[PDB]
Design a protein around this ligand. Structure first.
Ligand code: COA
Ligand code: COA
Ligand code: COA
Ligand code: VIR
Ligand code: VIR
Lengths: 205, 206, 206
C-alpha cells in the first residue's frame, strides 16, 4: 500500500510532485531516501536545484527519507568557493597564460558533505550552503539560508537560519530519535501512519 | 481630483503600476483599500502574488488605504502549512491507500488573518508570512521576511524582519494614529496633500 | 599575458562571464575598475542588474578592480527612495492634479554613493542597498542584503549582512592596504600572481 517509490511522478498526470530518488540515482555520489519528494516550482526536476556539484571535488549530498522539500529550494555544493588565503580573484580562469595559476585541490576550501536527515520539512526558496547538517524531523522556515547545522526536531528560520524552538520536549524527541519509524519495513509503517502523524507511536513501539 | 481608484491601470500608457482594489475585488476573503497600488515586476497582476489562499481555511487578507507595494512582494497565506503535531510528511497526498489519512480541518495549524494597515510601504521582494499584522505608517525594507507583527510607523527589515527604529516620536505617532487622515473624504485629503506629505497636518487638526 | 580587460567576453565560447568596465563604461555616473567581472545568471549583461539609477539624483556607483561578482547580484540606487518626512504615498506619481506635489530634489532621501572596493568577492544573489561602502578585499556571502558599510578584508553575510570575521591578522591587512597591488601595471602584477594568491607579496614588496 502506498505509491511506488521508483516513479519520478507518483501521482498519475501530475508532473509537479516528484520523488527525488529515481531522479537522482543516476548521479554520482548523491544519496536519497525513498519517499522524499520535491514540490516543483515551474515544472523543473530537482537535479536543476543542486548547484556547483563537481565529481573531482568529491563532496557528497545526503537526503534521508520522508522528506518534503518545498519549491525553489537550492542546495549549493563546494564548487563555488574560491581560494582565500590570498586574493579571491580567479586568475586561472581567464587563461592566456594564467592557467599556470590553477589551484591545487588541497588549496580550495571545502567545507564538507551536506546531509539532510529523515522526516525533514524544508520550506520554499530555502538556500542550503555547503557542508551543512540537518537533523531528523527538523523544520526549516520558507526563505531561510542555512549556513550551519540544525539539531533534530528543531524549527529554524532566517538568513542566517537559527534554531527558534524545540518541536517537542526532549523526552519525546529522545524516544523519537530512538524509534526511527522511517527505518521500519513499509508494511509496518502502513499500519501506523496514524500514530506517526500524531506522535502516539512512542507509546506503542 | 487625482486618479480613478477603480481603474486597473491609473497611469496612462503604463501597464506596470496598478490599483489593487479593482483586481482583488472579485476575490473572497479579501479586502483592499482605496488608493493602494502595486508596481508590477514582470507585468504580473497582484493576484498572482498571493499564494496558498483556499477559502476552505477561511483566513482573510486585509490591505488598507494608500499603500505602496514594491514589485515581487509575496503574500503567503495558510494553505501551505503542514500538520505538525507529528510527522510533517503529507501521506494523504500520494493516494494508493494513503488517501484515507487526509488531515482534519482543525488539525491544520492556522495562524490567523493577514492584516496590512494604511499608508504602509513595502519594499521590493518582501515575503509576508501567515497571520502577520503591519500597523499603519510602517516601512518594511526591501527583501525582508515578515514573521511577526510590526508596530505603527516603525521601520522594519531583515530576515526575520525586526523593528529597527520608530519613524517619529511617540507623541506624533500617537497623534497621527488618532487623526487617521486616510479615512477622510477625498476633497479634504486633496486639499491637505502637502501637510500629509510633511506631517504638519498634525498642528492643523489639533 | 592574460585577457585584455577591454574585451566584453574575456573567456572564449563563453557568453556568461563578462568584464564589467567595457559594458558599464557607457553609463552615466558609473565608475568600473579593470579586471572585475560578472558571472551571468541567465545571459543578462550586468547593466540590467543596476536598478533605479536616475542621473537627476546624481548619486554615483564606483567599483574597484579585480572584483569577482557572482550571478544575480543586484545593486539598488537612490531612485527608489520614497519621501518620508511624512506620508510615503507617491501622490505626484498619479497626476490628474496631484502632480503639484512632485517632491523637491532636496526633499528625497539620498543616502550617498555606493562604493565597492578592489579584490572584493560578492556572492550570488546578493542585494546591495543604496549608499553602502564595501572594503578592499572583503567577502560578502551569497544571498546577503547589504544595508550598512563593510570593512576591508572583512567577511560578512546575512540579511542584514553583518561583519562575521576578519580574513587575516590586523598586521597583514594593514600592509595589503598599503601595497595596493591592484594598482600596479599588469606587467608587474603578472609576475606575482602567485605571491598575491597566497599573501606572500607582503614579504617581497615591503
Ligand atoms: C516555520 C513555520 C512552519 C511556522 O512555525 P510554527 O510552528 O507555526 O511557529 P510560529 O509561527 O508561531 O513561530 C514562532 C516564533 O518563530 C518565529 N519565526 C517564524 N518563522 C521564522 C523565520 N523564518 N525566522 C525566524 N523566526 C521565525 C516567529 O516570529 C515567532 O517569534 P516568537 O516566538 O519570539 O514570538 C512557517 O513560518 C513556515 O515557514 N512554513 C513553510 C511554508 C513553505 O515554504 N511551504 C512549502 C512546502 S509545502
Ligand atoms: C528601509 C529604507 C527606506 C531605509 O530607511 P532609512 O530611514 O533611510 O534608514 P537608514 O538608512 O538610516 O538605516 C537605519 C538603520 O536601519 C538599518 N537597516 C536599513 N535597512 C535594513 C534592513 N533591511 N534590515 C535591517 N536593518 C536595516 C541600517 O543598518 C541602520 O542601522 P543603524 O540604526 O545602527 O544606523 C530602505 O533601505 C528601503 O528598504 N527602501 C525600499 C526600496 C524599494 O524596494 N522600493 C520599491 C517600492 S517604491
Ligand atoms: C561566506 C563563505 C565564504 C563562508 O565563510 P568561511 O570563510 O568559509 O567561514 P565559515 O563558514 O567556516 O565560518 C564563519 C562563520 O560565519 C558563519 N557564516 C557563513 N555564512 C554566513 C552568512 N551568510 N551569514 C552569517 N554567518 C555566516 C558560519 O556559520 C560561521 O559561524 P561561527 O563563527 O560560529 O563558526 C561562503 O558561505 C560563501 O558565501 N561563498 C560564496 C559562494 C557563491 O555564491 N559563489 C558564487 C561566486 S562564482
Ligand atoms: C566559481 C569560479 C568562477 C566563476 O565565477 C566563473 C564561472 O562561473 C564560469 C566558469 N568557471 C569555469 C567554467 O566556466 C571553470 O572551469 N571552473 C568553475 C569551477 C571550477 C572551475 C575550474 O577551472 O575548476 C578547476 C578544475 C576544472 C580542475 C579547478 C578544480 C579550479 C577551480 C577554481 O579555481 N575554482 C574557483 C571558482 C571559480
Ligand atoms: C520608486 C518610487 C515609486 C515607484 O513605486 C513607481 C514606479 O516604479 C513607476 C514609475 N515611476 C515613475 C514613472 O513610473 C517616475 O516618474 N518615477 C520613478 C522614479 C522617480 C520618479 C518620478 O516621479 O520622477 C520625478 C522626476 C521625473 C523629476 C521626481 C524626481 C520624483 C520622483 C519621486 O517621488 N521619486 C521617489 C520614488 C518612488
Amino acid at each position: 500500500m502506498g505509491p511506488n517509490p521508483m516513479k519520478m511522478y507518483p501521482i498519475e498526470g501530475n508532473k509537479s510532485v516528484q520523488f527525488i530518488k529515481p531522479i537522482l540515482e543516476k548521479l554520482e555520489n548523491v544519496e536519497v531516501g525513498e519517499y522524499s519528494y520535491y514540490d516543483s516550482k515551474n515544472g523543473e526536476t530537482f537535479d536543476k536545484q543542486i548547484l556547483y556539484h563537481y565529481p573531482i571535488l568529491n563532496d557528497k549530498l545526503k537526503i534521508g527519507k520522508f522528506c518534503s522539500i518545498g519549491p525553489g529550494v537550492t542546495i549549493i555544493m563546494n564548487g563555488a568557493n574560491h581560494r582565500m588565503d590570498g586574493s579571491t580573484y580567479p586568475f586561472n580562469l581567464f587563461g592566456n597564460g594564467w592557467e599556470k595559476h590553477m589551484p591545487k585541490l588541497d588549496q580550495l576550501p571545502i567545507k564538507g558533505d551536506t546531509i539532510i536527515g529523515n522526516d525533514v520539512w524544508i520550506g520554499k526558496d530555502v538556500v542550503i550552503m555547503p557542508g551543512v547538517k540537518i537533523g531528523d524531523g527538523a523544520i526549516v522556515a520558507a526563505n531561510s539560508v542555512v549556513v550551519k547545522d540544525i539539531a533534530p526536531y528543531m524549527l529554524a528560520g532566517g538568513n542566517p537560519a537559527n534554531e527558534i524552538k524545540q518541536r517537542f520536549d526532549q523526552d519525546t524527541i529522545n524516544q523519537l530519535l530512538d524509534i526511527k519509524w522511517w527505518n521500519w519495513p513499509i508494511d509496518i509503517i502502513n499500519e501506523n501512519i496514524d500514530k506517526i502523524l500524531d506522535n502516539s507511536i512512542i507509546r506503542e513501539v
